[PDB]
Amino acid sequence: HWGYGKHNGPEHWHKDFPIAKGERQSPVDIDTHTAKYDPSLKPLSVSYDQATSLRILNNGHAFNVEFDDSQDKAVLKGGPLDGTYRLIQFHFHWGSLDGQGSEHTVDKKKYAAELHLVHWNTKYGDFGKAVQQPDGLAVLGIFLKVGSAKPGLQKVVDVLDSIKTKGKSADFTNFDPRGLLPESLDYWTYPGSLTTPPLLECVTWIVLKEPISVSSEQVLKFRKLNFNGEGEPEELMVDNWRPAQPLKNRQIKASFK
Numbered sequence: 280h281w282g283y284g285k286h287n288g289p290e291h292w293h294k295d296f297p298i299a300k301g302e303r304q305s306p307v308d309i310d311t312h313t314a315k316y317d318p319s320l321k322p323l324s325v326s327y328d329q330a331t332s333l334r335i336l337n338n339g340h341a342f343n344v345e346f347d348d349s350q351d352k353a354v355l356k357g358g359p360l361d362g363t364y365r366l367i368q369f370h371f372h373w374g375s376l377d378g379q380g381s382e383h384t385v386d387k388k389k390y391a392a393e394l395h396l397v398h399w400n401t402k403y404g405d406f407g408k409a410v411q412q413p414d415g416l417a418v419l420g421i422f423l424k425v426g427s428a429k430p431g432l433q434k435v436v437d438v439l440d441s442i443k444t445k446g447k448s449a450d451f452t453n454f455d456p457r458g459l460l461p462e463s464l465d466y467w468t469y470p471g472s473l474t475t476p477p478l479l480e481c482v483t484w485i486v487l488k489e490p491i492s493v494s495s496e497q498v499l500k501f502r503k504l505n506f507n508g509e510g511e512p513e514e515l516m517v518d519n520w521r522p523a524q525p526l527k528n529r530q531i532k533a534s535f536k
């Protein structure tokens with residue numbers, strides 16, 4: 280099965296998932312000088328006040344904080360989007376070292392980690408239908424740099440000891456994802472894909488310009504997770520990022536000058 284190792288990592292994915300070499304793959308390098316301001320782009324509308332978190336799961340590739348998406352409780356609208364996109368889960372990608380871990384890069388710069396808040400277009404009725412559509416998902420991506428702690432992240436950090444290995448989950452109610460956002464909602468946007476298999480080309484990417492800062496201790500705790508299941512040989516969950524893919528026939532648009 281696919282993963283992030285030498286023998287099953289991103290260079291191998293195309294054999295099971297030929298769309299890996301497709302026309303709108305993610306992530307990409309964001310060349311800030313070549314991105315163009317699009318004055319028609321609207322401000323993002325992030326409406327997370329009624330978000331209902333449920334559970335946190337180690338799925339063997341990352342950990343997901345899952346939400347109740349059976350009603351419009353936490354939604355993303357505006358920006359490049361037409362319609363309403365419901366928050367289903369968030370997760371991170373991170374490195375073994377503070378100088379790598381993000382999936383997107385900015386002028387070739389890698390951040391220590393990247394947060395993905397995953398939303399699906401409610402006109403398609405369920406997430407499984409949405410991933411089959413070119414405008415099915417909107418993923419809000421937020422860079423993490425190492426510096427001061429992010430207080431809104433600490434509850435996530437605190438529970439990781441309970442989901443160390445693949446397949447473990449824990450209750451994770453009453454978590455407020457607003458505590459993970461930076462001050463500014465300025466963003467870049469482009470059409471892309473899931474960054475893991477099955478690599479479906481269903482995502483409108485919205486990547487925030489402003490990173491959040493997390494502490495060295497917070498990211499160290501991410502790095503104590505395991506890719507393996509309990510009772511299997513220990514493999515630290517680190518470097519679970521796909522590198523930047525060719526931009527091909529795409530333009531990245533900026534919401535800001």
Ligand SMILES: CN1CCN(NC(=S)Nc2ccc(S(N)(=O)=O)cc2)CC1
Pocket residue numbers: 368395397410418472473474475476477
């Ligand atoms: C077919 N089916 C599609 C649903 N997939 N589930 C999820 S949560 N996939 C998923 C993968 C990568 C991202 S990312 N890193 O692009 O945000 C976001 C979501 C399971 C398999």
Ligand SMILES: [Zn+2]
Pocket residue numbers: 370371372395474
């Ligand atoms: Zn992701």
